[PDB]
């Protein structure tokens, strides 16, 4: 038989043991994990020696041998806190969801600090965030820090 054993380490300490074929795609492995642990494949990110694995490629493509160990990172969903740092040294705390727009987020800042959204520029990972996008568009994560820049305004 060409089947073989591999291990999938989760970030909760649990190690999942799977039976696979070198010809199995990453897609198949995620379905095996769902069958075993109930985790939907759309939340699964599989990693081997630091490299993220693509759904349409095989264990063989990645040189994943018998007894190999993969790590499982989960995509987080639902409500979360983010932190917004100002030039004056303030850290504003916001309750948000990945689907909130940048427009929504600026409105939440206005509710907390009275700062007009048109005066706000939000920065994440060095990038200015554009109004019609969502937090998830920029891959913004739970407890991340954003930087709030205040434009010059005439009032």
């Amino acid at each position: 038989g060409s089947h073989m054993q591999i291990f999938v380490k989760t970030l909760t300490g649990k190690t999942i043991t799977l039976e696979v074929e070198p010809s199995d795609t990453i897609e198949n492995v995620k379905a095996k994990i769902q069958d075993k642990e109930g985790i939907p494949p759309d939340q699964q990110r599989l990693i081997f020696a630091g490299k993220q694995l693509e759904d349409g490629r095989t264990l063989s493509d990645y040189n994943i041998q018998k007894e190999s160990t993969l790590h499982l990172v989960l995509r987080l969903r639902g409500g979360m806190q983010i932190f917004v740092k100002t030039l004056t040294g303030k850290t504003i705390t916001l309750e948000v969801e990945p689907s909130d727009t940048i427009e929504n987020v600026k409105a939440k800042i206005q509710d907390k600090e009275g700062i007009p959204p048109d005066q706000q520029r939000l920065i994440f990972a060095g990038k200015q965030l554009e109004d019609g996008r969502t937090l998830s568009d920029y891959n913004i994560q739970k407890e991340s820090t954003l930087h709030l820049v205040l434009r010059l305004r005439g009032g």
Partner: protein
């Protein structure tokens, strides 16, 4: 709502290096931890490593 203590940051750094062991990843991990001092969730930190949001 509390910035990580040095021990909390060390614990997350050591866990991330096990997952992301290349020399370039080591630098990006440190830059991400420094940029986001409230992050305590290893999945969320891993997302920033995986999608290049350093």
């Amino acid at each position: 709502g509390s910035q990580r203590s040095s021990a909390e940051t060390s614990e997350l750094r050591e866990a991330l290096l096990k997952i992301f062991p290349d020399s370039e990843q080591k630098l990006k991990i440190d830059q991400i931890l420094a940029a986001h001092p409230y992050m305590k969730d290893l999945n969320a930190l891993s997302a920033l490593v995986l999608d290049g949001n350093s």
